[PDB]
Amino acid sequence: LRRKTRQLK
Amino acid sequence: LIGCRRAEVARTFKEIQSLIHVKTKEFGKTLNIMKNILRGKSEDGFLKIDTDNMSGAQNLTYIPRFCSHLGLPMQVTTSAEYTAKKCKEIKEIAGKSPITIAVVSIYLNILLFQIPITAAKVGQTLQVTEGTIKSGYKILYEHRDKLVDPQLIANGVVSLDNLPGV
Amino acid sequence: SFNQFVDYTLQDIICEDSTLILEQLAQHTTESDNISRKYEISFGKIYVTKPMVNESDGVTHALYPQEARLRNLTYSSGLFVDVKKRTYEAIDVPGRELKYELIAEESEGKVFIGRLPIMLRSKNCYLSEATESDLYKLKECP
Amino acid sequence: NAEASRVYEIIVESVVNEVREDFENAGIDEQTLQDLKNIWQKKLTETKVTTFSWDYLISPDENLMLCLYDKVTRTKARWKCSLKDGVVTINRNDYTFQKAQVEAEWV
Amino acid sequence: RITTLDETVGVTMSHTGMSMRSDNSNFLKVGREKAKSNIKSIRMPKKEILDYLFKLFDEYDYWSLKGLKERTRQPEAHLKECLDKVATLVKKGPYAFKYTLRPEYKKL
Amino acid sequence: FNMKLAINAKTITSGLKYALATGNWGERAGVSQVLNRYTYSS
Amino acid sequence: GYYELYRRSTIGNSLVDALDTLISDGRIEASLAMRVLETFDKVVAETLKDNTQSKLTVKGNLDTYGFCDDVWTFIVKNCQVTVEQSVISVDKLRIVACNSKKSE
Amino acid sequence: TSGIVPTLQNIVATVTLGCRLDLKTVALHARNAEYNPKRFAAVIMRIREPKTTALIFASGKMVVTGAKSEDDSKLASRKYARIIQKIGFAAKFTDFKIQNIVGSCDVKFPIRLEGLAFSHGTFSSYEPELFPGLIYRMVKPKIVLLIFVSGKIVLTGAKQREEIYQAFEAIYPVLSEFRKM
């Protein structure tokens, strides 16, 4: 239920 | 790679596999399947004469790219082209791969024109073991007059004594 | 304007969005996998080369504007950037602030990002430092 | 060998050192630690190997040892192996080593 | 100022596109470092499998298929053949897609 | 991961070549025109 | 729990005949003997790897090999070994090896 | 015609026994046997006086490799069946079939392989950067050939002697026409 990759500004 | 070999602009295997992370097994088998099915489709459709377009070695096409990666002058490129063309006459290097014979011919012409680059740098750039280059240079050291371009020594720009001893 | 764009504005544009960070969390599907990773790529300096052209067979030679005009080529120079890669790992446990540490795997690093067309007689073209008779040698009008 | 003798001495010292509390957990007397020593090295003096200061089927006074391996490289004739961390015996003489490269030609 | 490379253009294009220099950096080589783990197992007798399965359901009632594969180290076909005889998967409950023991073996 | 596949140089190359070849700027019209080589004053 | 290979050593068969004498005397029970053999193998396996420095090489000719129950068995005849040199020939020798991967 | 008859070096055959075999029992009881359950789901053995290797499977199928001739494979299968009978299992020669025969030969002259691949291209495929030997697939019979610049020709994928012999007889005139130096 997780999001794996994400963007860090 | 079939498209590269179709237009006399053929590439090698290592630079293809540097881009596509694929093993040699399925790539070779897929190449054989492609060649068989394209020849079958050409026989079913418009027949085409090969006249050395999907030749296995094609070592004459790999000379100027490696010379440009080494930054050699174009006269050295033409001399290495003549050397690679004349390597078909020698029976002791006929079974060698086109890449290694191109590399050793390029190194021989570098030592002929006294281009100040090392064999270690050539091995680092062209990803060839220095032992293979040394073995090719040793086996081509006896064949002096069969590889050096006769009008190059007729013009006096190169000489046979510039090659270092083995 | 073209000299200002090549010499200064290219570097500013690279340094504006040089840092690019991708974050991977623990993937808590099992208790052995509790590692958070952070991959940062940073574009360092930009280098612009002299004008050149690559051929069909991969042969690259320096291109001059007369040859570029006759062969229907583009009078462009490659751009390279010094990219630095940083990989960070951390123990991902609840109730504790994440502290990322370097894995000491930093490879460096010119990589081709594109051919910028070069305005003639800029600070980058061949004709800039050419003298008079050199400029007729290249089949150009003085 | 003196090296194998001191290795055997420190091995038997560590063995009689680490297990005393586990034996005391069983409720036996401390003299069990004593006489079990006396049957050991005396039997070693009966071994007479190391000097102590104390038609085709599978079917003591025999040469044998036990060891550990990591990788075995097998060819048509050669049978090389990176054998590691055991104790060998040759003609009733025990020796201790780190690594051995064993190879033999197939008949 | 920006830096102009004064060397030969071919040296700069050596690292371009087709470059038969192989890539050597270990940045994000996840496919290389997670394809090296392979599971291999054989057909051991059923009795020890059933005893270990009963022990693990006695430890906790609900498990996933990949968790069972990484715990008891079985082939997928043989693990399925051992599971479907004495256990079943939840279809619509809150613990769906998880194997659990049969209702007749709850009281054991 | 491949660094050559990571950065696609043809994005910048094709963007610059399309913006300088045609008059369209981006992705204003007629920003770039064919040079008028009729006389020197032109 | 390591492998149970260590039973055939000279210290191994010395221990098994000693525990046979204890069983005949009846002051040490059975599972106690099994666990003290287990910790004996543990102690010797941990302490055989750290405090030794010598080497050898083996030059021989095999006759029969086998790989069963995840252990390797070899027989070698007329083999030659070097001490740490000094060399001596062995008429018959048997090699039993276990994998470096730890069990249990 | 040919001045030299090619000789064989490996014959691979199979025999089905019609019985169930336990891999652990034949791995432990037999002397020269190896079994890696984590790697290959069969037991491997070999014998020296024909120098042949047996792939023994659990279903009773078994494969013999490394036979020089047909009678060598026959006696190897006989001794393997004796080993199975004497090890504690019942087996019978229900079906024995030879399925692979290879051979090697020399012509003792260099061959221009580039011209060979240019002329006989519809049956051959060349890739010297992977393997220096030309792979030739002739349509009748089903024999593959490995061609080398030293004149060493390797014929592979045969079942009997007449097909490999006629394959060499057909490949001799199209290869003897090429001469180097």
Give an account of the 3D structure.
The structure is cut from a larger assembly and holds 8 protein chains of 7 kinds. By secondary structure, chain A is mainly β. Chain A is 0% helix and 44% strand. Chain A contains no helices and 1 strand. Chain A is rod-shaped. Chain B has a domain at 62-155: Cyclin A, domain 1 (Orthogonal Bundle). In chain B, helix 4 packs antiparallel against helix 5 and helix 5 crosses helix 6 (98-113). The radius of gyration of chain B is 18 Å and the shape is globular. Chain C has 142 residues and is of the alpha+beta class. In chain C, the strands form 2 sheets. In chain C, strands 1, 2, 5, 6 and 7 form a 5-stranded antiparallel β-sheet that branches. A two-stranded antiparallel sheet of chain C has the order 3-4. The E-F interface holds E 16-17, 19, 23, 25, 27-30 and F 1-4, 9. Chain A: Belongs to the TFIIF alpha subunit family.
Question: What is the strand and helix layout of this fold?
Answer:
The structure is cut from a larger assembly and holds eight protein chains of seven kinds.
Chain B: H1 2-6, H2 14-19, H3 24-44, H4 63-70, H5 74-86, H6 98-113, H7 119-126, H8 130-141, H9 150-154
Chain C: H1 2-16, E1 19-24, E2 35-48, E3 52-54, E4 60-62, H2 65-70, E5 76-91, E6 101-102, E7 110-117, H3 132-137
Antiparallel strand pairs in C: 1-2, 2-5, 3-4, 5-6, 5-7
Chain D: H1 2-18, H2 20-25, H3 31-47, E1 64-74, E2 79-84, E3 87-89, E4 94-96, E5 99-104
Antiparallel strand pairs in D: 1-2, 2-5, 3-4
PDB class: transcription
Keywords: nucleosome, TF, transcription
Entry title: Yeast RNA polymerase II transcription pre-initiation complex with the +1 nucleosome and NTP (complex B)
